[PDB]
Amino acid sequence: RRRRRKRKREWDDDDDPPKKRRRLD
Amino acid sequence: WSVDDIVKGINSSNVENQLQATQAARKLLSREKQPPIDNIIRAGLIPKFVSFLGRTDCSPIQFESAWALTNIASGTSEQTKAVVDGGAIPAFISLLASPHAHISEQAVWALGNIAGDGSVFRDLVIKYGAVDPLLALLAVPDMSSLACGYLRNLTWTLSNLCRNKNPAPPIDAVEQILPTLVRLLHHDDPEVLADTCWAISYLTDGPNERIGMVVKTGVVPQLVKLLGASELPIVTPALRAIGNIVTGTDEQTQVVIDAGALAVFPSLLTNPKTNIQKEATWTMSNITAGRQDQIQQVVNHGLVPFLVSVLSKADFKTQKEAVWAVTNYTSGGTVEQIVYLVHCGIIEPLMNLLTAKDTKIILVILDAISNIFQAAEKLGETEKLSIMIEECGGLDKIEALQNHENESVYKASLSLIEKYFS
């Protein structure tokens, strides 16, 4: 048995911050 | 007002009429209804706003045009590109040093919207020298003197400056921004902490060199502290940054394990939120893919039973990460550690997943059982394992995979049946 490689992530957008915002009133 | 009226006013000679027209445009853009950004762009008004941004004499027109340009750049990539092409980035960077805080922070907002479009506009904002002024604003001796709203806006713009990939955030900006992120991680405001954790997450999602940059600052302990916070908006990015870090070298994973991260994983793995569970199980998988001492740390924290339980009774997306954890554990663990995994009841819940429709996961499960059989061989209890597998319904499910679900799975399942069950 040999050690397995580390799995780099798969990007998700479940609760990511906003890429753009608008100022309103 | 109408677009034609504002066009006539913005081009007028009176500074007051110009300010009134710019105000009308800003009000149209900040009116909650679907803004007419496309029409305002087609009106050729962006260059006029950019020119107004430089009117140090008239603070109102500066603020109004910056607000309008912010709202224009908050839309589609074409609209942000219209703002960028109008030379707005240098103007906003110049406004960053304005003696009025409202205009300076509106410029910060606009630059954040621009840098959020993608990596090209981000690299442009960094190219025109926005990093140092932006970071100077936060450097105020008392970050409390900087209103929490302004500090949040600055943190969000910096997060967008650390965001996106291909290309990744330039080294010149990261080497500047990381210390400020370390400082901000020690604040008590939740909205700032969440954005800072998100920025660190962006930075740790890539090559191991960036993970090492983030690790060498000594923030992993503070990230572990935030890992056990009651606020899910803060726990999501922190768990996520830790999961990204553990995808690097063994020294970095040991930095995470030394910070006491494992102590929190009993709560994360038993968390109601399915995404928290899945990401924590993925982190466990990348930790069980490390050195034997790291797997022993996982065992000592009593997380193997938790993994058995997420494999047995959870959703498929988390059960797959549990399968990966098991496979890496069996691939890099000692014979004693594998005996422990088996005695914890992994055989039945692992084989009860062979009935799925994922050739990849079926092959991984079969690799795991092959590793366990190798451990048994070393122990002299191969037939005991065969009997246990048979009685848990394992042989039936391994035989069911001889239906050529995939030639790979067929040959893998055939290899096991002939080796140990024939």
Side-chain angles (χ1 to χ4, degrees):
Chain A
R1 305 178 284 95
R2 303 179 182 178
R3 212 214 295 178
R4 288 286 249 277
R5 292 235 184 81
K6 300 221 182 192
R7 316 208 334 280
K8 285 283 180 191
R9 89 174 302 178
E10 321 96 333
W11 187 255
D12 186 21
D13 294 78
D14 52 356
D15 298 297
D16 288 18
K19 298 262 279 276
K20 278 163 185 167
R21 289 156 50 199
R22 184 151 68 90
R23 192 168 179 171
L24 288 115
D25 61 88
Chain B
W1 287 64
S2 82
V3 300
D4 305 329
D5 303 355
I6 294 169
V7 153
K8 292 272 157 163
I10 275 160
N11 274 94
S12 206
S13 295
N14 199 8
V15 85
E16 174 48 44
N17 214 45
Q18 280 182 323
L19 172 64
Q20 294 246 264
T22 311
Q23 281 171 5
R26 187 273 280 172
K27 189 68 221 77
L28 291 155
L29 288 159
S30 78
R31 166 254 297 155
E32 66 191 55
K33 208 213 309 209
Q34 280 181 349
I37 293 146
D38 273 308
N39 295 74
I40 285 154
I41 290 151
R42 220 176 308 98
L45 294 166
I46 271 160
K48 293 293 305 207
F49 295 141
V50 168
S51 319
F52 297 159
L53 294 174
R55 292 180 153 283
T56 80
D57 51 275
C58 193
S59 164
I61 210 174
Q62 282 185 316
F63 183 52
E64 291 289 336
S65 67
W67 193 329
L69 284 162
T70 294
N71 292 3
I72 289 157
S74 74
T76 66
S77 309
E78 165 170 89
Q79 299 168 4
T80 319
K81 174 172 213 303
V83 167
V84 166
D85 292 353
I89 296 167
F92 286 128
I93 294 162
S94 308
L95 278 172
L96 289 175
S98 176
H100 294 279
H102 55 95
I103 316 196
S104 167
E105 297 291 328
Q106 190 67 89
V108 169
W109 192 323
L111 288 167
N113 287 354
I114 289 163
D117 174 61
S119 302
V120 176
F121 287 4
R122 177 204 70 196
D123 289 325
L124 276 154
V125 169
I126 289 158
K127 194 169 149 69
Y128 292 117
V131 182
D132 188 71
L134 269 154
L135 290 175
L137 293 159
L138 294 117
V140 55
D142 190 25
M143 275 160 160
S144 306
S145 90
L146 179 65
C148 261
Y150 291 171
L151 175 59
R152 289 158 170 186
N153 179 51
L154 272 151
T155 306
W156 177 83
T157 293
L158 284 160
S159 99
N160 272 12
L161 283 171
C162 300
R163 197 168 183 176
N164 312 301
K165 303 199 302 192
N166 305 301
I171 289 281
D172 43 281
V174 173
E175 271 264 327
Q176 280 183 251
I177 292 166
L178 262 161
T180 310
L181 295 173
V182 176
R183 280 186 66 183
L184 292 177
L185 204 62
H186 287 95
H187 271 56
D188 49 313
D189 186 66
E191 219 274 319
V192 162
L193 284 169
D195 289 329
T196 296
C197 289
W198 272 111
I200 298 303
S201 99
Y202 308 146
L203 293 163
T204 54
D205 179 27
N208 296 2
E209 272 67 87
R210 302 306 196 84
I211 291 152
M213 281 185 72
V214 160
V215 162
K216 286 282 132 162
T217 75
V219 298
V220 178
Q222 182 74 349
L223 286 164
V224 165
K225 182 157 170 197
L226 288 157
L227 194 69
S230 37
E231 300 107 300
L232 194 128
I234 299 174
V235 170
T236 289
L239 168 64
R240 183 160 165 122
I242 291 281
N244 290 351
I245 290 157
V246 299
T247 78
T249 76
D250 308 335
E251 199 264 326
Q252 291 169 357
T253 307
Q254 202 67 76
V255 174
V256 163
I257 291 161
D258 290 356
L262 292 171
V264 193
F265 272 87
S267 174
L268 298 155
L269 295 162
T270 66
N271 197 272
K273 179 40 63 217
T274 51
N275 279 262
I276 291 292
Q277 217 190 339
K278 188 189 70 169
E279 287 171 357
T281 301
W282 167 72
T283 305
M284 278 280 290
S285 97
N286 287 332
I287 291 160
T288 49
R291 314 205 304 263
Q292 309 202 122
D293 51 90
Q294 297 181 1
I295 296 152
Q296 190 74 81
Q297 298 254 46
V298 175
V299 163
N300 291 153
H301 279 92
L303 313 182
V304 175
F306 285 74
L307 281 184
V308 174
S309 308
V310 307
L311 183 73
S312 318
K313 40 185 283 185
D315 56 285
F316 193 68
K317 300 309 189 184
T318 307
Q319 287 175 326
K320 283 167 38 204
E321 300 297 344
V323 154
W324 274 111
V326 164
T327 293
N328 299 342
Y329 183 112
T330 53
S331 291
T334 65
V335 168
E336 164 65 11
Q337 279 174 1
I338 291 162
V339 174
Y340 171 63
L341 199 80
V342 170
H343 284 202
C344 278
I346 208 83
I347 303 306
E348 177 154 30
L350 181 69
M351 300 219 189
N352 280 341
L353 279 145
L354 282 172
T355 74
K357 304 98 174 66
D358 202 345
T359 312
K360 174 147 179 71
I361 301 288
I362 290 156
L363 289 160
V364 170
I365 288 162
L366 290 167
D367 291 345
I369 86 171
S370 301
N371 293 347
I372 295 157
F373 261 109
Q374 288 164 65
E377 301 227 79
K378 305 218 198 82
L379 295 154
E381 308 200 81
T382 300
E383 193 227 8
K384 172 143 176 62
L385 181 63
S386 317
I387 298 148
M388 191 204 305
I389 291 170
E390 274 165 4
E391 294 166 355
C392 94
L395 188 54
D396 290 29
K397 290 181 183 82
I398 297 155
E399 284 168 343
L401 304 160
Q402 300 261 69
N403 298 339
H404 291 104
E405 173 168 5
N406 215 57
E407 198 63 49
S408 46
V409 156
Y410 170 81
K411 285 192 151 253
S413 70
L414 173 64
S415 188
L416 279 148
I417 288 155
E418 288 178 342
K419 279 166 146 279
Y420 308 104
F421 304 99
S422 300

